[PDB]
Amino acid sequence: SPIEEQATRLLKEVPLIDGHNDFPYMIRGWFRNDINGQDAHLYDMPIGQTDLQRLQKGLLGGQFWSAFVPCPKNPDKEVGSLEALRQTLQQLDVIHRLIERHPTILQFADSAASIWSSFRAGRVASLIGIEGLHQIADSVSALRMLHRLGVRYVTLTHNCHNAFADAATVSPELHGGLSRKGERLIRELNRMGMMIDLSHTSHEAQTQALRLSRAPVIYSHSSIYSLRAHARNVTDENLHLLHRNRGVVMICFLRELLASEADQATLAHVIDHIIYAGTRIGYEHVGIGSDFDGMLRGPDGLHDVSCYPALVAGLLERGVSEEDVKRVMGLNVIRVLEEVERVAAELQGAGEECLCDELDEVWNEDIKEQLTRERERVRKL
Amino acid sequence: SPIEEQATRLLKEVPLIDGHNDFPYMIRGWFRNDINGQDAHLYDMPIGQTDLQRLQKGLLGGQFWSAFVPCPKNPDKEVGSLEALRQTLQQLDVIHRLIERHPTILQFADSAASIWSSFRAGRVASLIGIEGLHQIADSVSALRMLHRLGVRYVTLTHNCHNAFADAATVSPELHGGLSRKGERLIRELNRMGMMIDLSHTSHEAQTQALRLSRAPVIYSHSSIYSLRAHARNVTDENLHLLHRNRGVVMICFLRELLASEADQATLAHVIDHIIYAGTRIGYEHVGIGSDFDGMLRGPDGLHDVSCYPALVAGLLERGVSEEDVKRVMGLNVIRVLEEVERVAAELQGAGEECLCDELDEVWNEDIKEQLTRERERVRKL
Ligand SMILES: [Fe+3]
Ligand SMILES: [Fe+3]
Ligand SMILES: [Fe+3]
Ligand SMILES: [Fe+3]
């Protein structure tokens, strides 16, 4: 078929970069992050929508791998918050080991340039995101260290309220959008060069974040509200504010977000949602955000990671131009990451003050007097 | 003076690399890790033994900056252990920000090659160590992520027992040296390329670690037992086992470790301890491990970081050769780090299995059956 050969050529020309895949959490579920001697199973998994053979088969160019851990469920709220931080380091650890043990398939990337060089080499560009600010345990210092470990986006919430923002699926609201701490964190996220992800956040939290952010943001896995009403889908108001922000909505394959009856969801529905967004806010602000392995079953025609060529062929078949399809595949998300880096370098170059954690005093006044007296004794020598 | 000009020439030829300095903890105590607009104070501190002006003045070539946090003091033992992990990320964060805000003075290094290139440029080579396995909150995954953040040594204990080893200053003993988990961690530390530090550990814990380690280790700040009996000083038995291990004892400036009366401790005592070790196990296994800012007051002649030229001149004055003084200054600790990297690359090249954390099951058998049934449905398509 000429349309299938066209799709194959496009997948070789530019990288298809998917916004969200929870394959690392499946490895925690199935292997408990012990991948020693499991190469055969990693290439041909007995569960889930992702493995290394099917990842090659679908011709995917890049992937933001999710370092998701669940919302804290402990009655002791201090323990649960701190537990999520330790679990986050476990998930980042298994992601890095997964990449390092399979360098012919996966190559780590943390920038627009590292995505391209990975793609030139024939590797799946392997980026990282965390899915909820509950994962940082109220520590902005921890956030900056997660950035140093390779994290390049932060979903502001999962399905739980935190100190910074409101999740979509939980009622009643806590902050009514972003908190006072949340507003201040947006500045710090822009300053450090961390891409903001608005999937899972409430409609009001999206509106406030889209006005306040000095860099373009993403929805790593969300769909369109006007086609299917859900708390997790993006309203026409927020799509318009995404346009002004210069961000990208990466369209989701979740069946519940594409149709009222989940078993009726299809490849065609995903293409409808892409075309809706592209028509109304331009094809330079739309992406692909599967959420593979964040679901049991996918839509008809998008059952696993091998099915990306069918999506590309489908978009071309509806009359979306090559240039616009290339944008949706990956160019748009690369641009956002590029702009997030440029804004961070500009703010860091101007010498903007970083956000610091509120720490307890470790010394009393007696200790501080001893230290000052000691310093002046040394000055006399 | 010809001996002072000789010392100045040596300090320019090779880097003096100090084993331990807790300046980052002083910044937590005094500033609470908020260094915004504090450059004037960072160059001329009102407290402590370290600042950026005196660091230049003493002609120090490199420094392992301590990311120390205190032993957990919480009655809830889960909270205290997890709290130490969050505090560790705060200390690593302020160390990185300290280096990034002062690039003319400090430059990050994580290897023998990065130490030299930093020294060629005229910067203080800025490395990182953590001071106690209580800082990892029982997570080997967290340990590997600390390595990725730039940590290049781990003191096995501070002044508290942990799941892996016994501290020197706490009685009674818990494990009687290393635990079963501790023995297994030694293999993982050698595999990942993390330098083992035996300061603060018990005499028996040192003996067991020195026999079991496949890479050379250090004492980042310890002194000689035969000259002054203390639980924190190295016995003649362990000095001999350090020789076989090919490790380095980095001599400490702590007054309590150099003399029975702390107020009698001097520069001469530090030189006595270096010469004792060098004479008995060779000058290629001795280093300098100040522990500046882990103490209120230093010995006479070693009051702060400006005093390193007096130590170098003092060693030359006692008849220690230039080549041997260069070794003590930094060549020895560079060699250990070099060998720790070479052993890690060899074991990683052979494909040795990494140590994994013991995780809870997140899925019950009903969820696992749904996932396998779903996988086989996809195989039928
Ligand atoms: Fe997810
Ligand atoms: Fe999700
Ligand atoms: Fe210390
Ligand atoms: Fe110490």
PDB file of C-alpha atoms in Angstrom, chain A residues 94-361:
ATOM      1  CA  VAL A  94      15.141   0.490  37.262  1.00  0.00           C
ATOM      2  CA  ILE A  95      14.590   2.854  34.274  1.00  0.00           C
ATOM      3  CA  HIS A  96      18.342   3.650  34.157  1.00  0.00           C
ATOM      4  CA  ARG A  97      19.295  -0.041  34.527  1.00  0.00           C
ATOM      5  CA  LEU A  98      16.773  -1.016  31.802  1.00  0.00           C
ATOM      6  CA  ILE A  99      18.427   1.501  29.424  1.00  0.00           C
ATOM      7  CA  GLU A 100      22.021   0.537  30.369  1.00  0.00           C
ATOM      8  CA  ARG A 101      21.428  -3.241  29.947  1.00  0.00           C
ATOM      9  CA  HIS A 102      19.868  -2.753  26.460  1.00  0.00           C
ATOM     10  CA  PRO A 103      22.000  -0.040  24.736  1.00  0.00           C
ATOM     11  CA  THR A 104      21.301  -1.365  21.185  1.00  0.00           C
ATOM     12  CA  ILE A 105      17.565  -0.562  21.634  1.00  0.00           C
ATOM     13  CA  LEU A 106      17.353   2.194  24.277  1.00  0.00           C
ATOM     14  CA  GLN A 107      19.530   5.295  24.698  1.00  0.00           C
ATOM     15  CA  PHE A 108      19.071   7.912  27.428  1.00  0.00           C
ATOM     16  CA  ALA A 109      18.092  11.446  26.343  1.00  0.00           C
ATOM     17  CA  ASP A 110      17.453  14.628  28.375  1.00  0.00           C
ATOM     18  CA  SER A 111      17.280  17.280  25.614  1.00  0.00           C
ATOM     19  CA  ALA A 112      16.310  18.066  22.018  1.00  0.00           C
ATOM     20  CA  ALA A 113      19.903  17.387  20.874  1.00  0.00           C
ATOM     21  CA  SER A 114      20.179  14.041  22.730  1.00  0.00           C
ATOM     22  CA  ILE A 115      16.826  12.937  21.214  1.00  0.00           C
ATOM     23  CA  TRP A 116      18.130  13.573  17.674  1.00  0.00           C
ATOM     24  CA  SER A 117      21.540  11.886  18.190  1.00  0.00           C
ATOM     25  CA  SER A 118      19.743   8.859  19.687  1.00  0.00           C
ATOM     26  CA  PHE A 119      17.422   8.810  16.645  1.00  0.00           C
ATOM     27  CA  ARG A 120      20.383   9.075  14.192  1.00  0.00           C
ATOM     28  CA  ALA A 121      21.885   5.973  15.872  1.00  0.00           C
ATOM     29  CA  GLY A 122      18.618   3.990  15.504  1.00  0.00           C
ATOM     30  CA  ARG A 123      17.816   3.878  19.248  1.00  0.00           C
ATOM     31  CA  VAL A 124      14.555   4.698  21.000  1.00  0.00           C
ATOM     32  CA  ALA A 125      15.282   8.043  22.694  1.00  0.00           C
ATOM     33  CA  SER A 126      14.600   7.270  26.353  1.00  0.00           C
ATOM     34  CA  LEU A 127      13.452  10.222  28.475  1.00  0.00           C
ATOM     35  CA  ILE A 128      11.928  10.285  31.976  1.00  0.00           C
ATOM     36  CA  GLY A 129       8.942  11.919  33.691  1.00  0.00           C
ATOM     37  CA  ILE A 130       7.430  11.671  37.188  1.00  0.00           C
ATOM     38  CA  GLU A 131       3.641  11.477  37.564  1.00  0.00           C
ATOM     39  CA  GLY A 132       2.616  13.630  40.563  1.00  0.00           C
ATOM     40  CA  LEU A 133       4.201  16.153  42.959  1.00  0.00           C
ATOM     41  CA  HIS A 134       3.421  13.673  45.782  1.00  0.00           C
ATOM     42  CA  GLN A 135       6.617  11.937  44.518  1.00  0.00           C
ATOM     43  CA  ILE A 136       8.929  14.771  45.780  1.00  0.00           C
ATOM     44  CA  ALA A 137       7.765  14.607  49.449  1.00  0.00           C
ATOM     45  CA  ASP A 138       7.371  18.420  49.747  1.00  0.00           C
ATOM     46  CA  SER A 139      11.083  18.926  48.872  1.00  0.00           C
ATOM     47  CA  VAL A 140      12.018  21.356  46.086  1.00  0.00           C
ATOM     48  CA  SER A 141      15.631  20.244  46.713  1.00  0.00           C
ATOM     49  CA  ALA A 142      14.542  16.669  45.917  1.00  0.00           C
ATOM     50  CA  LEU A 143      12.878  18.019  42.727  1.00  0.00           C
ATOM     51  CA  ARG A 144      16.183  19.555  41.537  1.00  0.00           C
ATOM     52  CA  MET A 145      17.984  16.269  42.287  1.00  0.00           C
ATOM     53  CA  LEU A 146      15.334  14.361  40.267  1.00  0.00           C
ATOM     54  CA  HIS A 147      16.151  16.776  37.404  1.00  0.00           C
ATOM     55  CA  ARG A 148      19.843  15.873  37.832  1.00  0.00           C
ATOM     56  CA  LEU A 149      18.888  12.149  37.645  1.00  0.00           C
ATOM     57  CA  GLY A 150      17.327  12.820  34.193  1.00  0.00           C
ATOM     58  CA  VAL A 151      13.687  13.728  34.955  1.00  0.00           C
ATOM     59  CA  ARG A 152      12.473  16.186  32.293  1.00  0.00           C
ATOM     60  CA  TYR A 153       8.771  16.538  33.115  1.00  0.00           C
ATOM     61  CA  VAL A 154       6.634  16.580  36.252  1.00  0.00           C
ATOM     62  CA  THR A 155       2.909  15.881  36.192  1.00  0.00           C
ATOM     63  CA  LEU A 156       1.627  18.267  38.888  1.00  0.00           C
ATOM     64  CA  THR A 157      -0.799  15.655  40.302  1.00  0.00           C
ATOM     65  CA  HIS A 158      -1.901  12.049  39.824  1.00  0.00           C
ATOM     66  CA  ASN A 159      -5.356  11.058  41.286  1.00  0.00           C
ATOM     67  CA  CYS A 160      -4.785  12.784  44.638  1.00  0.00           C
ATOM     68  CA  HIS A 161      -4.529  16.363  45.898  1.00  0.00           C
ATOM     69  CA  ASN A 162      -1.082  17.516  47.065  1.00  0.00           C
ATOM     70  CA  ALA A 163       0.352  20.694  48.660  1.00  0.00           C
ATOM     71  CA  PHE A 164       0.828  22.295  45.191  1.00  0.00           C
ATOM     72  CA  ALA A 165      -2.266  21.468  43.052  1.00  0.00           C
ATOM     73  CA  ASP A 166      -5.669  19.766  42.646  1.00  0.00           C
ATOM     74  CA  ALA A 167      -6.177  16.434  40.858  1.00  0.00           C
ATOM     75  CA  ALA A 168      -9.113  16.130  38.433  1.00  0.00           C
ATOM     76  CA  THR A 169     -10.696  12.910  39.767  1.00  0.00           C
ATOM     77  CA  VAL A 170     -10.888  13.845  43.503  1.00  0.00           C
ATOM     78  CA  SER A 171     -13.723  15.933  45.008  1.00  0.00           C
ATOM     79  CA  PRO A 172     -14.094  18.160  46.879  1.00  0.00           C
ATOM     80  CA  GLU A 173     -11.325  20.567  45.814  1.00  0.00           C
ATOM     81  CA  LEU A 174      -8.549  21.454  48.288  1.00  0.00           C
ATOM     82  CA  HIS A 175      -6.936  24.589  46.779  1.00  0.00           C
ATOM     83  CA  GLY A 176      -9.404  25.372  43.949  1.00  0.00           C
ATOM     84  CA  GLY A 177      -6.656  25.049  41.333  1.00  0.00           C
ATOM     85  CA  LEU A 178      -3.062  25.787  42.367  1.00  0.00           C
ATOM     86  CA  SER A 179      -2.037  26.513  45.963  1.00  0.00           C
ATOM     87  CA  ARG A 180       0.133  29.441  47.092  1.00  0.00           C
ATOM     88  CA  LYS A 181       3.079  26.998  47.124  1.00  0.00           C
ATOM     89  CA  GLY A 182       2.019  25.705  43.677  1.00  0.00           C
ATOM     90  CA  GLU A 183       2.169  29.188  42.110  1.00  0.00           C
ATOM     91  CA  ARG A 184       5.696  29.665  43.492  1.00  0.00           C
ATOM     92  CA  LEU A 185       6.748  26.186  42.257  1.00  0.00           C
ATOM     93  CA  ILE A 186       5.766  27.128  38.654  1.00  0.00           C
ATOM     94  CA  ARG A 187       8.465  29.843  38.687  1.00  0.00           C
ATOM     95  CA  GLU A 188      11.040  27.331  40.001  1.00  0.00           C
ATOM     96  CA  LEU A 189      10.053  24.685  37.405  1.00  0.00           C
ATOM     97  CA  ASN A 190      10.560  27.268  34.624  1.00  0.00           C
ATOM     98  CA  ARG A 191      13.874  28.366  36.181  1.00  0.00           C
ATOM     99  CA  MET A 192      15.347  24.827  36.510  1.00  0.00           C
ATOM    100  CA  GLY A 193      14.179  23.769  33.013  1.00  0.00           C
ATOM    101  CA  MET A 194      11.586  21.208  34.094  1.00  0.00           C
ATOM    102  CA  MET A 195       8.723  20.741  31.621  1.00  0.00           C
ATOM    103  CA  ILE A 196       5.286  21.147  33.257  1.00  0.00           C
ATOM    104  CA  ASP A 197       2.736  18.366  32.592  1.00  0.00           C
ATOM    105  CA  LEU A 198      -0.971  19.185  33.152  1.00  0.00           C
ATOM    106  CA  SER A 199      -2.466  15.686  32.674  1.00  0.00           C
ATOM    107  CA  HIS A 200      -4.403  14.479  35.775  1.00  0.00           C
ATOM    108  CA  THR A 201      -4.803  18.084  37.101  1.00  0.00           C
ATOM    109  CA  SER A 202      -8.166  19.848  37.516  1.00  0.00           C
ATOM    110  CA  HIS A 203      -9.620  22.224  34.886  1.00  0.00           C
ATOM    111  CA  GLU A 204      -9.042  25.243  37.160  1.00  0.00           C
ATOM    112  CA  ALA A 205      -5.471  24.105  37.984  1.00  0.00           C
ATOM    113  CA  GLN A 206      -4.770  23.941  34.224  1.00  0.00           C
ATOM    114  CA  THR A 207      -6.184  27.443  33.607  1.00  0.00           C
ATOM    115  CA  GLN A 208      -4.065  28.980  36.397  1.00  0.00           C
ATOM    116  CA  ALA A 209      -0.889  27.122  35.344  1.00  0.00           C
ATOM    117  CA  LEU A 210      -1.333  28.060  31.649  1.00  0.00           C
ATOM    118  CA  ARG A 211      -1.589  31.792  32.501  1.00  0.00           C
ATOM    119  CA  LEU A 212       1.266  31.770  35.045  1.00  0.00           C
ATOM    120  CA  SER A 213       3.930  29.657  33.245  1.00  0.00           C
ATOM    121  CA  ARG A 214       6.750  31.489  31.407  1.00  0.00           C
ATOM    122  CA  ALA A 215       7.582  28.349  29.350  1.00  0.00           C
ATOM    123  CA  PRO A 216       5.407  26.069  27.174  1.00  0.00           C
ATOM    124  CA  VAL A 217       3.832  23.083  28.976  1.00  0.00           C
ATOM    125  CA  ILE A 218       2.410  19.703  27.923  1.00  0.00           C
ATOM    126  CA  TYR A 219      -0.458  17.346  28.505  1.00  0.00           C
ATOM    127  CA  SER A 220       1.539  14.079  28.433  1.00  0.00           C
ATOM    128  CA  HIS A 221      -1.657  11.987  28.133  1.00  0.00           C
ATOM    129  CA  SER A 222      -5.028  13.767  27.872  1.00  0.00           C
ATOM    130  CA  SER A 223      -7.799  13.976  25.265  1.00  0.00           C
ATOM    131  CA  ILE A 224     -10.505  16.450  24.121  1.00  0.00           C
ATOM    132  CA  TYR A 225     -13.480  17.395  26.344  1.00  0.00           C
ATOM    133  CA  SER A 226     -15.868  18.506  23.558  1.00  0.00           C
ATOM    134  CA  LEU A 227     -15.704  15.045  21.897  1.00  0.00           C
ATOM    135  CA  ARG A 228     -16.006  13.159  25.225  1.00  0.00           C
ATOM    136  CA  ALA A 229     -16.813  14.843  28.565  1.00  0.00           C
ATOM    137  CA  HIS A 230     -14.448  13.676  31.340  1.00  0.00           C
ATOM    138  CA  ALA A 231     -12.573  15.362  34.220  1.00  0.00           C
ATOM    139  CA  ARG A 232      -9.294  14.160  32.598  1.00  0.00           C
ATOM    140  CA  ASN A 233      -9.915  15.738  29.152  1.00  0.00           C
ATOM    141  CA  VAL A 234      -8.997  19.276  28.044  1.00  0.00           C
ATOM    142  CA  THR A 235     -11.743  21.925  27.654  1.00  0.00           C
ATOM    143  CA  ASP A 236     -11.944  24.381  24.725  1.00  0.00           C
ATOM    144  CA  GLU A 237     -11.023  27.183  27.173  1.00  0.00           C
ATOM    145  CA  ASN A 238      -7.790  25.404  28.210  1.00  0.00           C
ATOM    146  CA  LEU A 239      -6.975  24.427  24.584  1.00  0.00           C
ATOM    147  CA  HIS A 240      -7.097  28.162  23.752  1.00  0.00           C
ATOM    148  CA  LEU A 241      -4.834  28.966  26.736  1.00  0.00           C
ATOM    149  CA  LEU A 242      -2.494  26.146  25.611  1.00  0.00           C
ATOM    150  CA  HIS A 243      -2.175  27.958  22.241  1.00  0.00           C
ATOM    151  CA  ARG A 244      -1.062  31.210  23.946  1.00  0.00           C
ATOM    152  CA  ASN A 245       1.294  29.188  26.182  1.00  0.00           C
ATOM    153  CA  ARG A 246       2.752  27.530  22.998  1.00  0.00           C
ATOM    154  CA  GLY A 247       2.286  24.075  24.600  1.00  0.00           C
ATOM    155  CA  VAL A 248       1.288  20.660  23.238  1.00  0.00           C
ATOM    156  CA  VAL A 249      -1.683  18.380  24.003  1.00  0.00           C
ATOM    157  CA  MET A 250      -0.485  14.774  23.577  1.00  0.00           C
ATOM    158  CA  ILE A 251      -3.589  12.731  22.696  1.00  0.00           C
ATOM    159  CA  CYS A 252      -4.405   9.771  24.957  1.00  0.00           C
ATOM    160  CA  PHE A 253      -5.363   6.166  24.035  1.00  0.00           C
ATOM    161  CA  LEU A 254      -7.379   5.606  27.270  1.00  0.00           C
ATOM    162  CA  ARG A 255     -10.730   4.040  26.265  1.00  0.00           C
ATOM    163  CA  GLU A 256     -12.658   5.886  28.993  1.00  0.00           C
ATOM    164  CA  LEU A 257     -11.397   9.243  27.621  1.00  0.00           C
ATOM    165  CA  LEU A 258     -12.357   8.434  23.972  1.00  0.00           C
ATOM    166  CA  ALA A 259     -15.934   7.047  24.346  1.00  0.00           C
ATOM    167  CA  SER A 260     -18.884   6.730  26.770  1.00  0.00           C
ATOM    168  CA  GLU A 261     -18.735   2.941  26.343  1.00  0.00           C
ATOM    169  CA  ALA A 262     -15.071   1.892  26.752  1.00  0.00           C
ATOM    170  CA  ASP A 263     -15.462  -1.251  24.586  1.00  0.00           C
ATOM    171  CA  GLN A 264     -16.485   0.969  21.601  1.00  0.00           C
ATOM    172  CA  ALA A 265     -13.160   2.920  21.578  1.00  0.00           C
ATOM    173  CA  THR A 266     -11.050   2.643  18.396  1.00  0.00           C
ATOM    174  CA  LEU A 267      -8.068   3.955  16.400  1.00  0.00           C
ATOM    175  CA  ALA A 268     -10.530   6.254  14.562  1.00  0.00           C
ATOM    176  CA  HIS A 269     -11.519   7.964  17.844  1.00  0.00           C
ATOM    177  CA  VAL A 270      -7.848   8.797  18.563  1.00  0.00           C
ATOM    178  CA  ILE A 271      -7.518  10.290  15.054  1.00  0.00           C
ATOM    179  CA  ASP A 272     -10.759  12.306  15.604  1.00  0.00           C
ATOM    180  CA  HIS A 273      -9.281  13.852  18.773  1.00  0.00           C
ATOM    181  CA  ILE A 274      -5.976  14.749  17.048  1.00  0.00           C
ATOM    182  CA  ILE A 275      -7.824  16.344  14.087  1.00  0.00           C
ATOM    183  CA  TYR A 276     -10.157  18.306  16.423  1.00  0.00           C
ATOM    184  CA  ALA A 277      -7.197  19.852  18.268  1.00  0.00           C
ATOM    185  CA  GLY A 278      -5.106  20.462  15.126  1.00  0.00           C
ATOM    186  CA  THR A 279      -8.007  22.145  13.315  1.00  0.00           C
ATOM    187  CA  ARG A 280      -8.820  24.499  16.230  1.00  0.00           C
ATOM    188  CA  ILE A 281      -5.404  25.374  17.747  1.00  0.00           C
ATOM    189  CA  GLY A 282      -3.054  24.312  14.897  1.00  0.00           C
ATOM    190  CA  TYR A 283      -1.184  21.043  14.281  1.00  0.00           C
ATOM    191  CA  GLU A 284       1.984  22.501  15.880  1.00  0.00           C
ATOM    192  CA  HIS A 285       0.276  22.157  19.341  1.00  0.00           C
ATOM    193  CA  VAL A 286      -0.824  18.466  19.142  1.00  0.00           C
ATOM    194  CA  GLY A 287       1.136  15.297  20.038  1.00  0.00           C
ATOM    195  CA  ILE A 288       0.783  11.582  20.849  1.00  0.00           C
ATOM    196  CA  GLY A 289       0.469  10.480  24.506  1.00  0.00           C
ATOM    197  CA  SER A 290      -0.513   6.794  24.490  1.00  0.00           C
ATOM    198  CA  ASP A 291      -0.518   6.003  28.220  1.00  0.00           C
ATOM    199  CA  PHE A 292       0.364   2.394  27.249  1.00  0.00           C
ATOM    200  CA  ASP A 293       0.724   0.245  30.412  1.00  0.00           C
ATOM    201  CA  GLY A 294      -1.422   2.753  32.357  1.00  0.00           C
ATOM    202  CA  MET A 295      -4.384   0.641  31.168  1.00  0.00           C
ATOM    203  CA  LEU A 296      -5.343  -3.052  30.884  1.00  0.00           C
ATOM    204  CA  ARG A 297      -6.730  -2.910  27.320  1.00  0.00           C
ATOM    205  CA  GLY A 298      -6.266  -0.400  24.470  1.00  0.00           C
ATOM    206  CA  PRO A 299      -8.591   0.746  21.652  1.00  0.00           C
ATOM    207  CA  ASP A 300      -9.268  -1.398  18.557  1.00  0.00           C
ATOM    208  CA  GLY A 301      -6.176  -0.931  16.356  1.00  0.00           C
ATOM    209  CA  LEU A 302      -4.005   0.480  19.191  1.00  0.00           C
ATOM    210  CA  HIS A 303      -3.640  -2.620  21.374  1.00  0.00           C
ATOM    211  CA  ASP A 304       0.122  -2.214  22.039  1.00  0.00           C
ATOM    212  CA  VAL A 305       3.360  -0.345  21.127  1.00  0.00           C
ATOM    213  CA  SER A 306       3.637  -2.222  17.777  1.00  0.00           C
ATOM    214  CA  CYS A 307       0.583  -0.272  16.445  1.00  0.00           C
ATOM    215  CA  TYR A 308       2.139   3.210  15.831  1.00  0.00           C
ATOM    216  CA  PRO A 309       2.444   2.761  12.011  1.00  0.00           C
ATOM    217  CA  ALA A 310      -1.364   2.314  11.830  1.00  0.00           C
ATOM    218  CA  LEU A 311      -1.858   5.669  13.629  1.00  0.00           C
ATOM    219  CA  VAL A 312       0.522   7.479  11.238  1.00  0.00           C
ATOM    220  CA  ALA A 313      -1.116   5.852   8.184  1.00  0.00           C
ATOM    221  CA  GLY A 314      -4.567   6.709   9.602  1.00  0.00           C
ATOM    222  CA  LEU A 315      -3.714  10.421   9.970  1.00  0.00           C
ATOM    223  CA  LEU A 316      -2.427  10.575   6.374  1.00  0.00           C
ATOM    224  CA  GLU A 317      -5.602   8.784   5.180  1.00  0.00           C
ATOM    225  CA  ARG A 318      -7.805  11.535   6.729  1.00  0.00           C
ATOM    226  CA  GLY A 319      -5.930  14.213   4.709  1.00  0.00           C
ATOM    227  CA  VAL A 320      -3.468  15.522   7.323  1.00  0.00           C
ATOM    228  CA  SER A 321      -0.340  16.693   5.452  1.00  0.00           C
ATOM    229  CA  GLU A 322       3.101  15.054   5.846  1.00  0.00           C
ATOM    230  CA  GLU A 323       4.514  18.175   7.535  1.00  0.00           C
ATOM    231  CA  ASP A 324       1.575  18.250   9.990  1.00  0.00           C
ATOM    232  CA  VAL A 325       1.871  14.490  10.676  1.00  0.00           C
ATOM    233  CA  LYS A 326       5.636  14.926  11.348  1.00  0.00           C
ATOM    234  CA  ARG A 327       4.745  17.693  13.829  1.00  0.00           C
ATOM    235  CA  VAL A 328       2.218  15.475  15.657  1.00  0.00           C
ATOM    236  CA  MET A 329       4.662  12.521  15.723  1.00  0.00           C
ATOM    237  CA  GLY A 330       7.474  14.336  17.570  1.00  0.00           C
ATOM    238  CA  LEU A 331       8.662  17.750  16.264  1.00  0.00           C
ATOM    239  CA  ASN A 332       6.168  19.589  18.532  1.00  0.00           C
ATOM    240  CA  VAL A 333       7.241  17.901  21.795  1.00  0.00           C
ATOM    241  CA  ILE A 334      10.916  18.425  20.797  1.00  0.00           C
ATOM    242  CA  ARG A 335      10.184  22.169  20.320  1.00  0.00           C
ATOM    243  CA  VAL A 336       8.564  22.445  23.781  1.00  0.00           C
ATOM    244  CA  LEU A 337      11.567  20.739  25.442  1.00  0.00           C
ATOM    245  CA  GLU A 338      13.858  23.037  23.391  1.00  0.00           C
ATOM    246  CA  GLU A 339      11.939  26.154  24.536  1.00  0.00           C
ATOM    247  CA  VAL A 340      11.846  24.911  28.178  1.00  0.00           C
ATOM    248  CA  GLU A 341      15.673  24.699  28.016  1.00  0.00           C
ATOM    249  CA  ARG A 342      16.003  28.168  26.415  1.00  0.00           C
ATOM    250  CA  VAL A 343      13.747  29.828  29.048  1.00  0.00           C
ATOM    251  CA  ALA A 344      15.718  28.107  31.851  1.00  0.00           C
ATOM    252  CA  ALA A 345      19.105  29.212  30.433  1.00  0.00           C
ATOM    253  CA  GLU A 346      17.797  32.800  30.109  1.00  0.00           C
ATOM    254  CA  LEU A 347      16.480  32.918  33.711  1.00  0.00           C
ATOM    255  CA  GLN A 348      19.613  31.171  35.070  1.00  0.00           C
ATOM    256  CA  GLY A 349      21.740  33.627  33.032  1.00  0.00           C
ATOM    257  CA  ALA A 350      19.882  36.617  34.520  1.00  0.00           C
ATOM    258  CA  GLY A 351      20.615  35.126  37.979  1.00  0.00           C
ATOM    259  CA  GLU A 352      17.098  34.492  39.303  1.00  0.00           C
ATOM    260  CA  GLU A 353      16.900  33.215  42.882  1.00  0.00           C
ATOM    261  CA  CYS A 354      15.953  29.546  43.297  1.00  0.00           C
ATOM    262  CA  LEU A 355      13.158  28.324  45.576  1.00  0.00           C
ATOM    263  CA  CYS A 356      14.488  26.881  48.861  1.00  0.00           C
ATOM    264  CA  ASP A 357      12.917  24.441  51.344  1.00  0.00           C
ATOM    265  CA  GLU A 358      11.840  25.630  54.812  1.00  0.00           C
ATOM    266  CA  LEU A 359      14.287  23.879  57.181  1.00  0.00           C
ATOM    267  CA  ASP A 360      14.359  23.516  60.974  1.00  0.00           C
ATOM    268  CA  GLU A 361      17.061  25.266  63.001  1.00  0.00           C
TER     269      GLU A 361
END
